[PDB]
Amino acid sequence: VDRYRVTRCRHEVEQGCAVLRATPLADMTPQLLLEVSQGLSRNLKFLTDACALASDKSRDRFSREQFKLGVKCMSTSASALLACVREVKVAPSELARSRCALFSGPLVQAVSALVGFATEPQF
Amino acid sequence: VDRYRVTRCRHEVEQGCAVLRATPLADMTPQLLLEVSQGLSRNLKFLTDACALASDKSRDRFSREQFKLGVKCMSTSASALLACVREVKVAPSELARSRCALFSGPLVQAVSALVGFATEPQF
């Protein structure tokens, strides 16, 4: 895989999660919330695409399965977060905004675990 | 839900993940690795059971979906970790042991997000 660009993905997911923690409820407009979701989905797509290719090289059967489980953990984390984001759009509250921070950790960690695996010194 | 016992679950998952980081490769026997997996699966079952019940109370449709997405994030994190654990059993190496620490974060965070949601001041 390409060390530089999987790292840039991970940086962009952390950046987008940071937007959801940094931005007060008053400034969480439909448009700000949409740019963040689109930036997250963009970076998840690339990372899933970057990992499919790496699965294709490795002869090892554990690796191929770990990419599959790593990507699925990433995609289920993403869905839990994107539902909180949608929800703070249609039902603004300090609590729904807190909920976004709460469901960021799982996504940031799922991405960090996938990218750390992908840059083991044999890809 | 029962604040005391969902918190004890979260503590036990953190404890079991800590065993995989604390224990040198030499001491990671089949039996130690098995007790940790069984303790994790025990605590995930309880937490999934504790959350099904909470889903059953809430009239809110977002909550019901968030429990579903929260549990699924937890169960996909668990699978990614348990494959690394199995793998350090059948292919002991410092790298496979590191991989266990790498795939703990997603599980600890998925559990922390689910338990934090479950103890929002309305359950």
Residue numbers in the entry:
A (entry chain A), B (entry chain A): 148 to 270
The authors write:
Talin rod domain–containing protein 1 (TLNRD1) shares 22% homology with the talin R7R8 rod domains, and is highly conserved throughout vertebrate evolution, although little is known about its function. Like talin R7R8, TLNRD1 binds F-actin, but because it forms a novel antiparallel dimer, it also bundles F-actin. Increasing TLNRD1 expression enhances filopodia formation and cell migration on 2D substrates, while TLNRD1 down-regulation has the opposite effect.
To determine the extent of the structural similarity between TLNRD1 and talin R7R8, we used x-ray crystallography to solve the structures of both full-length TLNRD1 (TLNRD1-FL) and the four-helix domain (TLNRD1-4H). In both the TLNRD1-FL and TLNRD1-4H structures, the four-helix bundle forms an extensive interaction with a four-helix bundle of a second TLNRD1 molecule. An identical dimer interface was observed in both the TLNRD1-FL and the TLNRD1-4H structures, which crystallized in different space groups. The surface of each four-helix bundle has a pocket created by F270’ and the small side chains of G217’ and A260’ that the F250 aromatic rings docks into. TLNRD1-4H bound to RIAM with similar affinity (Kd 0.59 µM), confirming the RIAM interaction is mediated by the four-helix domain.
